[PDB]
Amino acid sequence: GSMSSFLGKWKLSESHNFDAVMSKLGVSWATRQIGNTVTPTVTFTMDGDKMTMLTESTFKNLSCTFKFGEEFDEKTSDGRNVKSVVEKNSESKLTQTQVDPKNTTVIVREVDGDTMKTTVTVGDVTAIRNYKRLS
Numbered sequence: 001g002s003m004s005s006f007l008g009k010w011k012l013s014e015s016h017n018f019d020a021v022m023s024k025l026g027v028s029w030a031t032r033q034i035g036n037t038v039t040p041t042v043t044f045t046m047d048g049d050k051m052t053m054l055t056e057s058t059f060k061n062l063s064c065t066f067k068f069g070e071e072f073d074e075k076t077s078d079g080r081n082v083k084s085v086v087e088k089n090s091e092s093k094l095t096q097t098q099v100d101p102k103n104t105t106v107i108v109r110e111v112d113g114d115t116m117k118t119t120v121t122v123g124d125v126t127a128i129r130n131y132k133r134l135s
């Protein structure tokens with residue numbers, strides 16, 4: 001099936017330069033501190049033309065469901081209403097674009113074996129967050 005390497009659960013293992021990106025996004029001090037501490041678990045399932053990503057943490061539990069190439073409305077974990085689309089780059093890579101009125105966030109997720117690397121870019125600032133596959 002499609003995106004089969006994404007399927008299952010993933011837990012954040014490492015984060016590099018993430019404060020630079022939320023700072024740039026205008027995220028509140030207090031939510032930024034939570035964002036620099038919590039280690040979420042992310043679950044992907046693929047059900048038809050649709051992928052679902054569930055994010056679970058002590059802060060918030062959050063889900064989104066999408067068709068590739070199809071714009072949709074999203075509220076981010078920090079509370080911003082954004083227009084997003086997720087594009088399929090390959091069976092092992094997808095790119096999510098989130099457009100708020102102040103900024104645009106590009107989130108690339110690429111699976112390589114037991115690592116999902118998530119690259120987050122807002123203008124000229126980039127963060128990389130590595131997730132390990134669970135079980």
Ligand SMILES: CCCCCCCC/C=C\CCCCCCCC(=O)O
Nearest residue numbers: 022027034035040077078118120129
């Ligand atoms: C990883 C998101 C869950 C963290 C919740 C705490 C609040 C985070 C603040 C701003 C998030 C906006 C930046 C985009 C996050 C996606 C990155 C990812 O999947 O690891």
